[PDB]
Amino acid sequence: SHMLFQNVSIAGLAHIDAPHTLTSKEINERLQPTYDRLGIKTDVLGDVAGIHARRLWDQDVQASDAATQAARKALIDANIGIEKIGLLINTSVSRDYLEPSTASIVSGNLGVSDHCMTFDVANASLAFINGMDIAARMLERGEIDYALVVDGETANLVYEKTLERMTSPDVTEEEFRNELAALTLGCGAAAMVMARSELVPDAPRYKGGVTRSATEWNKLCRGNLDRMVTDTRLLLIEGIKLAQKTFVAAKQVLGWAVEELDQFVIHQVSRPHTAAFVKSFGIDPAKVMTIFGEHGNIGPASVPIVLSKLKELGRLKKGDRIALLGIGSGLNCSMAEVVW
Amino acid sequence: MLFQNVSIAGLAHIDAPHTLTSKEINERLQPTYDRLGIKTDVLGDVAGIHARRLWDQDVQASDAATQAARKALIDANIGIEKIGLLINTSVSRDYLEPSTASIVSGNLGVSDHCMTFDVANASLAFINGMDIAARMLERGEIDYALVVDGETANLVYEKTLERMTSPDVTEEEFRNELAALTLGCGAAAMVMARSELVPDAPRYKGGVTRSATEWNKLCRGNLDRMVTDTRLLLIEGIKLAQKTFVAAKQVLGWAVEELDQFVIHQVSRPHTAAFVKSFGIDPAKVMTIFGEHGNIGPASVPIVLSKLKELGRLKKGDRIALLGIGSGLNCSMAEVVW
């Protein structure tokens, strides 16, 4: 068995795209005097990072609100009412308060029953996979019939404040480079209904996968509500090394061979970061969908949003072996498999 | 259906070093007490908090959680390389990203096989963390797990006290920020393990959870502010626990008299007393540290359990109930057989 999940399925899946488009052209327009003062002549966002646009919410939209929208849509996709949900896990980096959990707020909005167990899981960009794993263990045991995993991300504040700091006449080069990665973030939401396979015989199967870590690199990317500081160079270098370890483990327990997988759903930080990843592991780029160019990095929601879009586009066929890959601040790297 | 192969290998707690008494707080609030015409000692006489502990300046949650974790490892007689999972369950947190757990892990020097993340669920998160770890242990995914929790309330005291002594504050502003002055600093950590590795260790049975998420607006807190309505929390919490007991006194075969210890999360002395009274619980079987330490959030339950252990109180076979009502509302009840 290799400790892989049995009889755990995905009954429903949905994503929400934030409505307001913010182009990198517009951002560069604001940053140009700082660019000129700093001697920067290259479009670091559009040409280097490879981000042309990202999406934002309204100011008054909280993480719980975005997650709730995604959740209502996932339930419809699974054709079930909220009364069937026995577990709700929120996995977003963004959060309303220190307490209560964002999950309890979303659950309050949806109207879960008194039997519904809820809490948040936080683990940077890999948290949704952690949420799926935690749910999978309860579903496999048969403690619950259905679970919701939800994730709403809000980057409005970090965009507002970073742009203000970076347009300061007294901003330093170092501070500018430190905070630049925050301008690759985007808003969005995703939700997944998981279920015991007996209940949804034709639904895709979730097997789970492997995790490797490098927690001595926990300082590389630190973020709060209004600010994110990132060592992009070291993230690339140490990320690839960690992914290498995880891939070796993935071949051991998942029996993976790149050419035998049909889709790779990869969490993305930037275009060259992804290209380095794809190249180092000999992956077919035609099996790697990217939304980064127009939506940017949506944290832990990135993986399920891309998966949901793949389904929406009709790219997933019955029998397709789908790899869920990611490197998250930690450092952590998780690799799991979905059989459509 | 309960957990069969899950044990508690190690347990530890950290008491914060600095004492701030309610008498000392009241001296600072006295000019505001003399305005507004307030003559009641709400902290000391009503809430039942006479003191709390604060960390030194610039101590993060991860620092406190790291301290507790080092002690829990020692109590368990294992090195950090044995740990396959580390969960941080604290309300307090260093950043939104990355996890506070990854920072604690980096401090400890966990191996590249160690899985880490945070769990947030108000005062119940430690029990959530124990359950999540318990399931991985039973599946054979890991042999040892660390559940850690450090809380810091230094900033929320500094900020609230600043506000309360401002010349513009009203009687209603004042009252609604007394709740923050019932919080305390502290940290706890637990090592959990597969039972065939630790045959003498206490067994963890798991438990039940009931929720009333319709009341998620009652207690909202951040690092520098907390706003509450304690009165509503009391009635609806107890009502929730009653539903949880129906499930608890069914799945866990629970009967109040046949339980040896009650490790209960405390919001205040009156809240605790009403709970004990409502369910016919022997109050002698309910150890309390609230009077001296205040509310330590989700670390409260493991801290008291650790203190019970250190006292050499618990005996083999003791049936211990971990009980808590958390912001949500959530109510979890679990059993540990010593």
Give the H/E segment covering residue A207: strand A205-213
Structure tokens at B197: 């590795």
Domain boundary among B198, B224, B242: B198
Angle between helices A102-110 and A63-78 (to 10 degrees): 50
Please indicate, yes or no, whether residues A36 and A181 belong to a single structural domain of this protein.
Answer: yes
* Cβ pair A153, A298 in contact under 8 A: yes
Residue B50: Cβ-neighbour burial (10 angstroms; 0-12, 13-18, 19+): middle
Instruction: Indicate the Cα dihedral angle A223, A179, A328, A108, nearest 10°.
Output: 40
Q: How far is CA A86 from the centre of its chain?
A: 23
**CB within 8 A of B231, min separation 6: which ones?**
none
A46 and A180 housed in the same domain: yes
Last residue within a domain, chosen from B198, B229, B258: B198
CA distance B216 to B233: 10
Q: Do both A106 and A194 map to the same domain?
A: yes
CATH number at residue A219: 3.40.47.10
Q: Which of A71, A76, A61, A154 is nearest to A116 (CA)?
A: A71
As given in the structure block, the two tokens for residue B108 are 């400890």
Under 8 Å between Cβ of A125 and A181: no
The first and second tokens of residue B288, run together, are 């309390």
A274 and A337 assigned to the same domain? yes
Which two three-digit tokens encode residue B282? 């022997």
Calpha distance B55→A306 (Å, rounded): 44
- A234 plus A270 within the same structural domain: yes
Resolution (A): 2.4
Angle at B185 between CA B181 and CA B191, to 5 degrees: 145
What DSSP state is assigned to residue B97?
Answer: B
> In a mutagenesis test of the A interface, which of B102, B210, B227 is the best target, namely the one with the most A β-carbons within 10 Å?
B102
Q: Cβ contacts of residue A158 below 8 Å, gap of 6+?
A: A182, A185, A223, A225, A226, A227, A228
Q: Are residues A53 and A195 in the same domain?
A: yes
In degrees rounded to 5, what are phi and psi of residue B21?
A: -85, 160
Two tokens at B273?
A: 């007393």
| DSSP label of B178 | S
Contacts with A114 from chain B: Cβ below 8 Å: 210-212, 240, 243
Scan residues 141-170 of B and list those with Cβ closer than 8 Å to A.
141
By the 8 A CB rule, do B74 and B91 touch?
no
Report residue B267 as tokens: 């919001």
Cβ–Cβ under 8 Å, residues A158 and A185: yes
Distance from CA of B29 to the nearest CA of A (A): 27
Look at chain A and report how many structural domains it folds into.
2
Cα distance between residue B155 and residue B59, in whole Å: 11
Distance CA A32, CA B268 (A): 56
**Any B CB within 8 A of A213 CB:** yes
CA separation for the pair B65, A237 (Å, rounded): 29
Cα–Cα distance for residue pair B138/A138, rounded to 1 Å: 12
Q: How close, in Å, is residue B284 to chain A by CA atoms?
A: 31
DSSP string, A51-108: --EEEE--TT--HHHHHHHHHHHHHHHHT--GGGEEEEEE--S--S-SBS-HHHHHHH
Q: Which of A215, A216, A229 to mutate to test the interface with B (most CBs of B within 10 A)?
A: A215
Give me the residue from B140, B210, B220 closest to A115, CB to CB: B210
B175 and B262 in a single domain? The answer is no
Same domain, B153 and B222: no
Range of the domain at A338: 201-340
Find the radius of gyration of the CA atoms of chain B.
20
Looking at the structure, do residues A223 and A327 belong to the same domain, yes or no?
Answer: yes
Q: Which of B165, B198, B231 is the last residue of a domain?
A: B198
> Within this chain, do residues B254 and B317 fall inside the same structural domain, yes or no?
yes
Could you tell me if B38 and B181 lie in one domain? yes
Q: Are residues A29 and A152 in the same domain?
A: yes
